[PDB]
Amino acid sequence: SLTGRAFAIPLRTRFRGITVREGMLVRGAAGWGEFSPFAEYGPRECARWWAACYEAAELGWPAPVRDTVPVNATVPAVGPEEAARIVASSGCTTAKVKVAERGQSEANDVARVEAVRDALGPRGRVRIDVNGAWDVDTAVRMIRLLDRFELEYVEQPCATVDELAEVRRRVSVPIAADESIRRAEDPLRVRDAEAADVVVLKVQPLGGVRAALRLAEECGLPVVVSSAVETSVGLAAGVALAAALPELPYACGLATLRLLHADVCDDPLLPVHGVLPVRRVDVSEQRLAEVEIDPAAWQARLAAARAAWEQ
Amino acid sequence: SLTGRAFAIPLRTRFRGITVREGMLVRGAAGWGEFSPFAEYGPRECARWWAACYEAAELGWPAPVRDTVPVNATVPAVGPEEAARIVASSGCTTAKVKVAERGQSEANDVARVEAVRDALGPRGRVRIDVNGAWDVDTAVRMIRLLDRFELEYVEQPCATVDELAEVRRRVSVPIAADESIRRAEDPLRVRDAEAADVVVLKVQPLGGVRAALRLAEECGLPVVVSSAVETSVGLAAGVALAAALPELPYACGLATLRLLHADVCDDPLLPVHGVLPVRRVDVSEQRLAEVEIDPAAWQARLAAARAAWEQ
Numbered sequence: 001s002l003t004g005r006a007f008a009i010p011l012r013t014r015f016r017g018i019t020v021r022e023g024m025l026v027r028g029a030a031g032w033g034e035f036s037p038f039a040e041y042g043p044r045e046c047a048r049w050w051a052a053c054y055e056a057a058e059l060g061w062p063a064p065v066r067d068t069v070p071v072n073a074t075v076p077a078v079g080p081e082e083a084a085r086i087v088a089s090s091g092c093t094t095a096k097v098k099v100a101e102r103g104q105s106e107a108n109d110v111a112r113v114e115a116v117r118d119a120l121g122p123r124g125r126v127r128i129d130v131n132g133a134w135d136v137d138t139a140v141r142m143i144r145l146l147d148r149f150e151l152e153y154v155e156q157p158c159a160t161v162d163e164l165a166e167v168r169r170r171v172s173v174p175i176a177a178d179e180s181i182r183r184a185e186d187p188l189r190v191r192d193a194e195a196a197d198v199v200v201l202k203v204q205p206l207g208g209v210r211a212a213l214r215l216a217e218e219c220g221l222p223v224v225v226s227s228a229v230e231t232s233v234g235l236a237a238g239v240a241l242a243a244a245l246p247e248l249p250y251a252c253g254l255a256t257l258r259l260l261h262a263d264v265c266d267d268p269l270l271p272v273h274g275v276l277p278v279r280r281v282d283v284s285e286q287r288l289a290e291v292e293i294d295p296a297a298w299q300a301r302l303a304a305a306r307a308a309w310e311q
Numbered sequence: 312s313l314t315g316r317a318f319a320i321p322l323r324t325r326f327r328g329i330t331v332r333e334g335m336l337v338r339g340a341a342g343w344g345e346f347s348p349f350a351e352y353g354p355r356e357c358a359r360w361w362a363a364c365y366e367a368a369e370l371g372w373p374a375p376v377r378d379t380v381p382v383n384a385t386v387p388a389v390g391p392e393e394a395a396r397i398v399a400s401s402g403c404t405t406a407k408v409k410v411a412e413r414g415q416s417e418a419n420d421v422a423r424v425e426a427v428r429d430a431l432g433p434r435g436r437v438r439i440d441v442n443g444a445w446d447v448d449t450a451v452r453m454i455r456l457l458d459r460f461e462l463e464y465v466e467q468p469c470a471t472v473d474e475l476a477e478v479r480r481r482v483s484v485p486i487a488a489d490e491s492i493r494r495a496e497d498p499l500r501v502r503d504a505e506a507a508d509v510v511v512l513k514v515q516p517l518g519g520v521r522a523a524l525r526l527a528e529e530c531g532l533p534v535v536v537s538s539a540v541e542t543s544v545g546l547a548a549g550v551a552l553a554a555a556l557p558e559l560p561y562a563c564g565l566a567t568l569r570l571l572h573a574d575v576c577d578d579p580l581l582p583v584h585g586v587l588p589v590r591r592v593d594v595s596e597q598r599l600a601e602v603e604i605d606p607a608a609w610q611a612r613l614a615a616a617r618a619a620w621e622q
């Protein structure tokens with residue numbers, strides 16, 4: 001195109017219901033920004049995704065207070081052996097395991113978490129993400145059952161804040177709010193309803209680093225940063241947010257570049273010893289060209305999100 | 312701008328509900344003044360904060376009667392482990408501990424005060440600040456429970472003067488008034504109702520050093536000076552007030568610069584051996600630029616506060 005270009009990168013394994021990650025990269029005065037909302041989101045919800053991309057490309061991010069950020073391994077809803085192998089090849093001591101994947105059984109989840117705990121040893125930290133797939137009763141039951149593997153916290157066990165609050169009062173395992181933070185009328189409900197012990201922050205859906213920092217301040221709860229499975233361009237913003245937070249009690253979910261078959265930078269944001277450096281990424285003209293698709297449709301989508309944001 | 316310049320400095324840890332300290336610095340004939348009222352305060356309440364800034368930048372302060380001022384360690388609502396470390400490394404023999412933080416348990420407060428007492432040893436002085444969070448009955452029993460750690464005084468146990476007066480009649484621990492002094496229609500009601508043994512003075516909220524000295528005399532009660540978590544510019548005014556008071560029976564809460572991630576001076580006002588020197592501070596163009604932000608919003612806010620003060 002010229003400045004804003006679309007890409008389509010296949011994932012190494014189905015994650016969040018997709019097998020291909022699409023988005024657009026935009027070059028601005030501050031550097032590169034990534035606009036990659038998942039397909040189903042309308043312009044109104046994409047507005048904030050645009051705001052994040054705009055901030056990254058045109059405004060820049062708040063200075064970091066740390067030069068590196070710790071990350072957790074991301075384990076998709078796969079089999080126990082491969083789940084254990086992702087952990088073994090991660091270099092991370094904390095792992096977040098997907099559970100309650102549509103079409104799978106609760107037995108699969110137990111086997112997966114078990115495999116992950118064994119792969120980490122007794123010292124590892126194990127989290128699970130339900131993406132709100134369980135009702136209150138099932139959540140209390142499963143959390144209790146899976147806690148024999150010692151859980152650090154359970155991310156979004158149920159769909160709504162009221163449900164998280166109920167679960168929180170019936171289990172000892174800490175609860176983290178994600179969807180109730182990034183896809184909710186009022187994110188502060190988590191705080192007021194004391195529905196979670198930890199608040200998850202994702203840069204794009206929250207409208208950028210400054211927006212995410214403000215929300216973290218308003219909630220007054222321990223926070224953790226995670227990605228939306230972006231290329232190194234999008235991940236750099238996530239790293240920027242994690243590096244700007246006053247305190248990072250939890251390893252961040254920014255080791256997701258491994259989930260993609262390729263990246264758009266010559267020096268990808270790949271963790272080393274479970275840690276990522278705080279740095280801007282330089283897009284590789286040649287690397288992008290290899291995964292760049294026709295920009296028309298994506299440019300139209302970006303324009304719609306922009307309008308929604310400005311109007 | 313060329314005159315008033317806005318800053319945004321991240322805190323090392325959440326305190327008083329914020330994670331970033333914003334404000335404006337103004338250079339006048341006398342030196343630098345700081346205007347940093349917290350976000351929620353309207354122009355009428357901000358009027359005194361402006362008056363303090365104006366006094367510091369344009370008028371100068373009353374000559375000091377002492378060359379250094381003693382300070383107490385400020386302990387945020389953190390875990391017992393870190394609370395102890397803050398005190399042990401403070402160089403202070405007096406520590407003020409935050410209790411009744413929204414969302415925390417009374418058990419946490421007991422654990423925190425205990426850890427602080429243990430850190431200071433037997434000869435230390437321990438105060439607690441409730442920020443008016445407790446009702447009368449709760450304050451009475453909590454003060455009794457926490458007094459097994461030997462409290463110097465309890466700062467603002469309840470929200471209103473009438474409540475402080477009732478608590479004072481039922482407990483043996485001295486009571487200090489803070490918000491009942493700085494955020495009240497009639498500060499002297501504290502004296503008239505004999506609701507406190509100690510009066511807390513904060514420069515910006517009270518409208519400056521001269522205004523604070525005037526109130527100190529009228530209240531006819533022992534006083535202590537503390538900060539509003541300012542940069543060295545604002546803290547210099549607090550030190551100036553402490554240095555001009557007849558006597559300082561209590562160490563002052565001016566050891567708060569450590570709560571900020573950075574300062575605007577090359578020679579920051581950090582205590583050494585529990586004292587701060589009484590001296591003007593020189594702002595560093597470089598240090599300020601690093602945390603400076605667009606002053607548009609803040610300049611508009613300062614003009615409103617100033618307008619409210621002059622009328």
Ligand SMILES: O=C(O)CCC(=O)c1ccccc1C(=O)O
Nearest residue numbers: 016074096129226227228229253
């Ligand atoms: O947190 C991680 O380990 C990676 C981020 C992640 O899991 C994720 C990725 C895309 C969409 C949603 C989520 C989620 O946290 O639920």
Ligand SMILES: O=C(O)CCC(=O)c1ccccc1C(=O)O
Nearest residue numbers: 327384385407537538539540564
């Ligand atoms: O007194 C100290 O130790 C530091 C000053 C302090 O506690 C404070 C700082 C900001 C806002 C309110 C207060 C307070 O004393 O209630």
Ligand SMILES: [Mg+2]
Nearest residue numbers: 129155156178
């Ligand atoms: Mg999640």
Ligand SMILES: [Mg+2]
Nearest residue numbers: 440466489490
């Ligand atoms: Mg106080």
